[PDB]
Amino acid sequence: KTNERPIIGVLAQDVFDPKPDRNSYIAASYVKFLESAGARVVPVMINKSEDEYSRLFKSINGVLFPGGGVSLESSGYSKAAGIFYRLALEANSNGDYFPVWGTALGFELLTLLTSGELLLSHTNTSGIALPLDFTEDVKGSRLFKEFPEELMKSLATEPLTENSHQWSITTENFTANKKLKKFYRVLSTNTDGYNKFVSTMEAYDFPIYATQWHPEKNAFEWTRPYIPHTPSAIKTTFYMANFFVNEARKNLHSFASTEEEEKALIYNYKPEYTGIQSAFEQTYFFN
Amino acid sequence: KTNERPIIGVLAQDVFDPKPDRNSYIAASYVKFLESAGARVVPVMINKSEDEYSRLFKSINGVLFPGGGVSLESSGYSKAAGIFYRLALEANSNGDYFPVWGTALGFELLTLLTSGELLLSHTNTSGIALPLDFTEDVKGSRLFKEFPEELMKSLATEPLTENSHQWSITTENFTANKKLKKFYRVLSTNTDGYNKFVSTMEAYDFPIYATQWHPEKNAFEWTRPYIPHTPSAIKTTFYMANFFVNEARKNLHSFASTEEEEKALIYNYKPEYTGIQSAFEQTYFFN
Amino acid sequence: KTNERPIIGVLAQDVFDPKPDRNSYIAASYVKFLESAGARVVPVMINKSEDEYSRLFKSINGVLFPGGGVSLESSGYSKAAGIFYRLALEANSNGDYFPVWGTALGFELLTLLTSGELLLSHTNTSGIALPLDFTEDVKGSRLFKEFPEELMKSLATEPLTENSHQWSITTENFTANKKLKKFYRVLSTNTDGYNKFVSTMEAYDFPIYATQWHPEKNAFEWTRPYIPHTPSAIKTTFYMANFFVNEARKNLHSFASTEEEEKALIYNYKPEYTGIQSAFEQTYFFN
Amino acid sequence: KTNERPIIGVLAQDVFDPKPDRNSYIAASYVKFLESAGARVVPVMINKSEDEYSRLFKSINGVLFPGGGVSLESSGYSKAAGIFYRLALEANSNGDYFPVWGTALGFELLTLLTSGELLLSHTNTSGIALPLDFTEDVKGSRLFKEFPEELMKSLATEPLTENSHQWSITTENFTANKKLKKFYRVLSTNTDGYNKFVSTMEAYDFPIYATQWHPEKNAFEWTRPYIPHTPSAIKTTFYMANFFVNEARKNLHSFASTEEEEKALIYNYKPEYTGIQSAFEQTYFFN
């Protein structure tokens, strides 16, 4: 059995200077990223109850931790993600399949969630488009199984992936951490010319997937001139989202009633246009 | 040379029971369809002057005529479509590549704009998922040339295409029309059980493409049980938009200033949640 | 006094390309609809004199005007329907209870016979199953008075009603017509997502009942994938017919002789298997 | 899983003075009884191989043995009934649900099929309408579980069941036979003044149902003056068929090809008008 009505949570995060009706936000590119692959999206509010989180967890079919610039240790975002990560290992360990996706900051949070340590170094990866330096492990990987042959080749040779992070984990520090090296399979790496770092990974034993780069930006964000926008960059955003949503089709959670479902969906929120001045064309702010 | 920042216009259309800020509308699914293939979107208002359309026309890279229930004759929609149709035939014959996409009603409109006549007849197709019966002409087609092999086999055999139209142009009445037979290559047909009708076509000499069915619904609309949502239904909507956005990338129009660009963009408006009652999850309403 | 052997007429309708022995038709499903509720049926032929209709009217106990695609103003079907309508208004006015049923085209013709105008609009309603949106007036209504509560609930909430019509009267056009507003209680409405339209009505002062949908298809027609065939859809068809034959049992007309009765009954005719081709499994053709 | 397109076979019986194209027959009132409850019908021919019947058993969803006056021991009907009986116990005992209905003659054949003995006694029941005398065991019962409470009460107290049989199993002889008492639950009895007899029963362990009376006559047969035709008789015939067809919806058989299905259906045959002379208004005759 499969769930052909998947619903995916996208984690909201603390606004730097918070005001009423502007306490947390989601960049609209993460929603469009999932919608395009055939999912609906519920926004996961930041400072809720353990009980609200577990009730929502039980209703939705997978979750995404987006990029950004909030604290990995003290934020509403980091607490919420911790709750979701725990419920996800519990559900999956029990035999209930629940995928989790980490992008950029979410990637970095996953390395801390699993290692319990914060092992990020500085890298020159602030504004740039890069290929993927795939590891030997890609060939049997989950994430890339259904990617067209030709797209894998473009990925390996063309600047298709958006990087806007000042922190990475080096491959050195990755291997040397026993829990990390046991828990995650590295699928690609990259280098800023002095540091080689992990760019894509997937857990060995769990449907947890993470990218240091921003697959959602290629199709949806137009706000910086280096953003990859070639035809094969667009296919990349699709194929990546396609894989994750197909993972969320293995999850058979539903909402308790259609009315609870309708009220949770992102459709209840209207974004602002923020792309004149900020990194995001549109962003949903929340109270 | 190529335009890797393509901007496509989507035509708004008359609201049956209008008011200020609600004179016309665009289903959000049309907007999502194009953005997912790496384009930005400009909503194209309904009762504008010729000069205003010709300015918009000269700035954008493609145009989409979406589905709907308005008149093919006396609506502001029909009026704007004819102007864009004329503008695009002019530019393409002069040597300026500008693509046009019609869906459902947009497909019905095109038969009318190019034949001079209303050739539509009734079909039992107001809410059904159908495969595509490909013609022999599919082989050398432009629309499907970069579809995966497995996807075409899927289209030929699985109900992936959403039909919700009460009218169609039968294969008989298409063929008997000298103007339509010389202008358009039929790529697929379907039957409603009784009448065989044209379901996909493209112009022989002009980048004008049209489906009687709704490619955008598969990923984006969840308001009717029959809407195809299988993985290959999702791939269909992506590769249909990918082809058309590829077309608009051959057009080198741009707006006179970034300021002018910024104010045209769909980002400037906010949709309304219409998904509990209507066929649309979200709809943009315009004054 | 009741009449426990009711006989109801069904109007035959003009065949599009008429030939001897194939001038008019009745779809068999209208015959089965009435027999199931314990009536016998007489076909009402198309191009007969007033006198022959008067004698048939005086002998039968109710009449049904079926759906189809014949002209509402110039057909043999409309001429004969108009004669039965006048005779029924007279009989009822004089104190002889005589029920009339209109289905689809039959419902459409009733708006014309009573208002004296054609008030139909196009609706996207050609081959979909809908629930009924009941009005506040179902509570007092005659038609639905003996339906089980659970059936009335299923009708409000499940797609039990077969729509296959190009045309409807919108509830705004219905209400704006003083004659129809005065004559008919609307019992249910529906929308095609553009215009809300009347789906079921009953005359305030006459036993005239009309549905824009086809209650006869659920049990008897298997030619299109969307026709409602759940157990509640099967019950619907029974209880609809049941109500109407109960109206006919209040009429005490009888045939001048058993030998005349015997010659008029539908048993004198054999239907053709039309189901491979047409929307009707079986159809009775008449000279 | 449920089957919303059930097809049920109805067994033809030996014509007494047979002629080409008149070797066997089905009274049309049994076809009407099942089509009204939402089924399609296949006539089961009399003189065929076990292989042909096994093929058709494996395609259809249920079977009905109708009344008549052919021998219970050596007719084509009895032999083909035996075969269907054996195929049914086998499929049910394996776990594939397949219901069997016997009416009057078919009831009496089921007593012989199950007991190996003819145990029938003369009753004065050749043309009389009776109420059902329910046993305490009706309260557990499968057959009557979804009848409206008012209808159950009417059946207890009004002559709603048609009896046209000269032979019955007395309750004394039923109980005395070890195999029948082990196999069937008696749901109702009746008396003719002189002997109490079994009128309705269902197998304890199989979906096998039988009435000594004729449920299909009330709505569909108008030849004899004792036939019940009150509104509650009409409801009695629907509910009875509605139970059986809901049993057939639990079977998931289907024909191999759509073409073989079309060729087997009753629609391929035309009945004769037999109402003037015989007990049946209409009768299908077969080669």
TrEMBL record, chains A, B, C, D:
It catalyses: (6S)-5,6,7,8-tetrahydrofolyl-(gamma-L-Glu)(n) + (n-1) H2O = (6S)-5,6,7,8-tetrahydrofolate + (n-1) L-glutamate. One of its GO terms (biological process) is tetrahydrofolylpolyglutamate metabolic process. It is found in: Secreted, Extracellular space. GO terms for molecular function: gamma-glutamyl-peptidase activity. It comes from the Eukaryota. The active site is at A104 (nucleophile), H214, H214 (proton donor). SUPFAM superfamilies: Class I glutamine amidotransferase-like. Its EC number is 3.4.19.9. InterPro entries: Class_I_gatase-like (IPR029062), Pept_C26_g-glut_hydrolase (IPR015527), Peptidase_C26 (IPR011697). One of its GO terms (cellular component) is extracellular region. Belongs to the peptidase C26 family. This is folate gamma-glutamyl hydrolase. It comes from Danio rerio.
